[PDB]
Ligand binder design. Structure first.
Ligand code: HEM
Ligand code: NA
Length: 207
């Protein structure tokens, strides 16, 4: 089933992602709110690009049940960032890192070419990752740095009653998505590429 193959084909990359210098330092309480904020600003840029690609691919009729609009993060993130930065000025001030530029370019390609299987891979990497682990990151931002949970709405999914039931449903949706052999190989390749993009974002953030 595709869910298991996605997990297994990216397991090594997931492990590298848990041990990136920036993300490891952040979660162990060795950085600070400033660094968490920089993370969230870059995330806002790529979630914005991701959600345009989602919208396009959903509109095309591909993977519609998987592409649940309750997952959308960009607007919630912007409200977090308003709280973290003290105003809405950051929107006009932030600049994409080179890795974020590259990720945003790929997401815009996926959007404009309506690359459904690519989009689903990036959807899995982002949303199932935040569904799974985002609770932990949020708890640690609060515990290590005193971030108010009002600035942690990104890690809370309001439209989702029960996360464990949700993740099971999501995996089952992956398992039922009708794909040609070539579309499936592309989806799996793209999931690897999504982690590499993520790894380069964290790399830039630690530099
Ligand atoms: C930032 C880059 C990360 C990405 C893109 C990401 C992505 C993912 C994905 C896609 C899954 C689902 C695996 C599956 O069941 O198919 C997952 C699970 C998980 N993630 Fe990550 N992850 C990242 C970082 C982290 C970090 C730093 C931690 C440690 C706090 C973490 C903790 C976990 C744990 C414990 C699970 C197991 C399932 C669960 O907790 O419900 N992740 N992640
Ligand atoms: Na291209």
């Amino acid at each position: 089933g595709l869910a298991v193959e996605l997990k297994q084909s990216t397991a090594q990359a997931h492990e590298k992602a848990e041990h990136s210098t920036f993300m490891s330092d952040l979660l162990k309480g060795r950085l600070g709110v400033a660094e968490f904020t920089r993370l969230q600003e870059q995330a806002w840029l790529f979630y914005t690009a991701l959600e345009q690609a989602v919208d396009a691919v959903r509109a095309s009729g591909f993977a519609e049940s998987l592409l649940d609009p309750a997952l959308n993060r960009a607007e919630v993130l912007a409200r977090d960032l308003d709280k973290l930065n003290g105003s809405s000025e950051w929107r006009s001030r932030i600049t994409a890192s080179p890795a974020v530029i590259d990720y945003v370019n790929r997401l815009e390609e996926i959007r404009d070419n309506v690359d459904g299987p690519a989009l689903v891979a990036h959807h899995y990497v982002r949303y199932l990752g935040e569904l799974s682990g985002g609770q932990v990151i949020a708890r640690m931002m609060q515990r290590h740095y005193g971030v108010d949970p009002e600035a942690l709405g990104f890690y809370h999914f309001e439209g989702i009653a029960k996360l464990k039931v949700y993740k099971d449903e999501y995996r089952e949706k992956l398992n039922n998505l009708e794909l040609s052999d070539e579309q499936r190989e592309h989806l799996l390749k793209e999931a690897t590429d999504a982690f590499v993009f993520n790894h380069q974002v964290f790399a830039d953030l630690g530099k």
